[PDB]
């Protein structure tokens, strides 16, 4: 459960956020193989729920109907198509799993589901799957109202319902082989993995005896005896009483204060600056690096509908992203996941967007397809940010520097740092509100090589910076506080 199963070269995923499977599946082909890409992160591809007040948002696929592959992003038939193109490509795909619930109890009953399957939440009935009473715990929640109200009771944190949504009883053999149906549907259709939502709210103990039922991967893609990459969605920031290490016997976790700490850092607050990273990792209080699954930001958070707060950089913070994402990617701790996200009309009203439940770029809640302009950009809303030439190139630099220690570490006392790994790349930051000017070791073998931030090697030869490593290792950095990117990158593949 903690190898990623990616192909030996792959060190990231990326997470295409409301992606329909056809435009996926081209994605992996056109795009996401050739640059070196593991794997895709995709929504849920089960039933859910349809809601049209607000307007289909983002959050509907949280609320399940059934297990059915039937869903805005498409149908069974095209989700396996997308899964065989892409394993046939070397890149990975890993389900969102949404099985600590169904959809909220105050949801209306009928037939508003993205395939119609009838639903009735009041009666506790799902007969898609088949569901009842019976696989709920509300007999089992001992909170008044029957939701979570207090969080440092780590037992109706598993119990109850999390913010209304209907909690399936997965001590139940029954439930807990109807989830394993769901999983093992996919798994033979070709999934490498999973991500366990809301797995904070379930009992480590619930998912071991899941994951027990689950069957090893195909061996059509994958050797035999693979187990399913997980990873559990548990957002621990200390303070309470469950803890992400107690996760940790049935795979890895998402290291949320990995995003939190780096975006505070990164903005300079509380008096932080970049050059406390040095010990980075295990050393500020995450968790195990072999256990981490780190992001700068996720679906969530992103819109504030996440732990992190305002601390979170985003793509709406463009030129800080950029750095977060390449430190994220250039530093060893964990398994990186990388964004790719929509643009939506933000709104403050009083220091809150109100406008952060809507969904993907849609025609009458027909979500747009991704469009690829002449530059590699994409179109109808799409920010694609795992194309941007900063984060794509670094993306290319963990898989070069895969393996390579941490080392060569400087720093000004202030925010302009430096290290390497190994010999087979270096990175310089400046942070600071004045220009960047020294010569650093590297560690680097002698050469010309092209900054992978500013430009690309290209036939030869470098369309941005060109960085000039002597004998001993040393070369010369310089970066103006007032470059569009602050930052200077370069490795083995990189060279001229
Ligand atoms: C690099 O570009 C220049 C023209 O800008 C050219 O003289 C040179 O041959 C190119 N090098 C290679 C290896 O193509
Ligand atoms: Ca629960």
């Given at each position: 459960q903690?190898?990623?199963?990616?192909?030996?070269?792959?060190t990231?995923?990326?997470?295409?956020?409301?992606?329909?499977?056809?435009?996926?599946?081209?994605?992996?082909?056109?795009?996401?193989?050739?640059?070196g890409?593991?794997?895709?992160?995709?929504?849920?591809?089960?039933?859910?729920?349809?809601?049209?007040?607000?307007?289909?948002?983002?959050?509907?696929?949280?609320?399940?109907?059934?297990?059915?592959?039937?869903?805005?992003?498409?149908?069974?038939?095209?989700?396996?198509?997308?899964?065989?193109?892409?394993?046939?490509?070397?890149?990975?795909?890993?389900?969102?799993?949404?099985?600590?619930?169904?959809c909220?109890?105050?949801?209306s009953?009928?037939?508003?589901?993205?395939?119609?399957?009838?639903?009735?939440?009041?009666?506790?009935?799902?007969?898609?799957?088949?569901?009842?009473?019976?696989?709920?715990?509300?007999?089992?929640?001992?909170?008044?109202?029957?939701?979570?109200?207090?969080?440092?009771?780590?037992?109706?944190?598993?119990?109850?319902?999390?913010?209304?949504?209907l909690?399936?009883?997965?001590?139940?053999?029954?439930?807990?082989?109807?989830?394993?149906?769901?999983?093992?549907?996919?798994?033979?259709?070709?999934?490498?993995?999973?991500?366990?939502?809301?797995?904070?709210?379930?009992?480590?103990?619930?998912?071991?005896?899941?994951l027990?039922?689950?069957?090893?991967?195909?061996?059509?893609?994958?050797?035999?005896?693979?187990?399913?990459?997980?990873?559990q969605?548990?957002?621990?920031?200390?303070?309470?009483?469950?803890?992400?290490?107690?996760?940790?016997?049935?795979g890895?976790?998402?290291?949320?204060?990995?995003?939190?700490?780096?975006?505070?850092?990164?903005?300079?607050?509380?008096?932080?600056?970049?050059?406390?990273?040095?010990?980075?990792?295990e050393?500020?209080?995450?968790?195990?690096?072999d256990?981490?699954?780190?992001?700068?930001?996720?679906?969530?958070?992103?819109?504030?509908?996440?732990?992190?707060?305002?601390?979170?950089?985003?793509?709406?913070?463009?030129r800080?992203?950029?750095?977060?994402?390449?430190?994220?990617?250039?530093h060893?701790y964990?398994?990186?996941?990388?964004?790719?996200?929509?643009?939506?009309?933000?709104?403050?009203?009083?220091?809150?967007?109100?406008?952060?439940?809507?969904?993907?770029?849609?025609?009458?809640?027909?979500?747009?397809?991704?469009?690829?302009?002449?530059?590699?950009?994409?179109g109808?809303?799409?920010?694609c940010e795992?194309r941007?030439?900063?984060?794509?190139?670094?993306?290319?630099?963990r898989?070069?520097?895969?393996?390579?220690?941490?080392?060569?570490?400087?720093?000004?006392?202030?925010?302009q740092?430096?290290?390497?790994?190994?010999?087979?790349?270096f990175?310089?930051?400046?942070?600071?509100?004045?220009?960047?000017?020294?010569?650093?070791?590297?560690?680097?073998?002698?050469?010309?090589?092209?900054?992978?931030?500013?430009?690309?090697?290209?036939?030869?030869?470098?369309?941005?910076?060109?960085?000039?490593?002597?004998?001993?290792?040393?070369?010369?950095?310089?970066?103006?506080?007032?470059?569009?990117?602050?930052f200077?990158?370069?490795?083995?593949?990189?060279?001229?």
């Open positions: 903690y190898s990623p199963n990616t192909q030996q070269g792959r990231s995923i990326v997470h295409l956020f409301e992606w329909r499977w056809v435009d996926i599946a081209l994605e992996c082909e056109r795009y996401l193989a050739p640059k890409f593991g794997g895709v992160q995709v929504s849920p591809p089960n039933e859910n729920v349809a809601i049209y007040n607000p307007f289909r948002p983002w959050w509907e696929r949280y609320q399940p109907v059934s297990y059915k592959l039937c869903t805005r992003s498409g149908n069974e038939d095209e989700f396996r198509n997308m899964v065989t193109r892409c394993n046939n490509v070397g890149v990975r795909i890993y389900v969102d799993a949404v099985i600590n619930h169904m909220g109890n105050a949801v009953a009928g037939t508003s589901s993205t395939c119609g399957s009838y639903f009735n939440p009041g009666s506790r009935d799902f007969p898609a799957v088949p569901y009842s009473g019976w696989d709920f715990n509300d007999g089992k929640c001992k909170t008044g109202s029957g939701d979570i109200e207090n969080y440092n009771d780590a037992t109706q944190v598993r119990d109850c319902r999390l913010t209304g949504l909690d399936l009883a997965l001590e139940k053999d029954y439930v807990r082989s109807k989830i394993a149906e769901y999983m093992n549907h996919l798994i033979d259709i070709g999934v490498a993995g999973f991500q366990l939502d809301a797995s904070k709210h379930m009992w480590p103990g619930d998912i071991k005896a899941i027990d039922k689950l069957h090893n991967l195909n061996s059509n893609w994958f050797p035999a005896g693979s187990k399913p990459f997980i990873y969605e548990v957002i621990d920031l200390g303070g309470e009483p469950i803890k992400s290490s107690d996760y940790f016997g049935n890895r976790v998402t290291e949320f204060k990995y995003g939190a700490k780096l975006g505070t850092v990164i903005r300079k607050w509380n008096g932080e600056k970049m050059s406390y990273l040095k010990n980075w990792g050393g500020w209080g995450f968790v195990p690096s256990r981490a699954l780190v992001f700068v930001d996720n679906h969530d958070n992103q819109r504030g509908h996440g732990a992190g707060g305002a601390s979170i950089l985003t793509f709406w913070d463009a800080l992203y950029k750095m977060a994402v390449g430190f994220m990617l250039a060893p964990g398994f990186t996941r990388v964004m790719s996200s929509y643009r939506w009309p933000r709104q403050f009203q009083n220091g809150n967007d109100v406008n952060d439940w809507v969904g993907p770029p849609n025609n009458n809640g027909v979500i747009k397809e991704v469009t690829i302009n002449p530059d590699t950009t994409c109808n809303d799409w920010v795992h941007w030439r900063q984060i794509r190139n670094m993306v290319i630099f898989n070069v520097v895969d393996g390579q220690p941490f080392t060569n570490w400087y720093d000004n006392g202030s925010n740092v430096a290290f390497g790994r190994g010999n087979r790349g990175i310089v930051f400046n942070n600071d509100d004045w220009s960047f000017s020294l010569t650093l070791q590297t560690g680097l073998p002698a050469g010309t090589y092209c900054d992978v931030i500013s430009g690309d090697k290209i036939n030869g030869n470098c369309t941005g910076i060109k960085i000039y490593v002597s004998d001993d290792g040393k070369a010369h950095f310089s970066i103006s506080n007032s470059a569009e990117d602050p200077i990158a370069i490795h083995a593949e990189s060279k001229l």
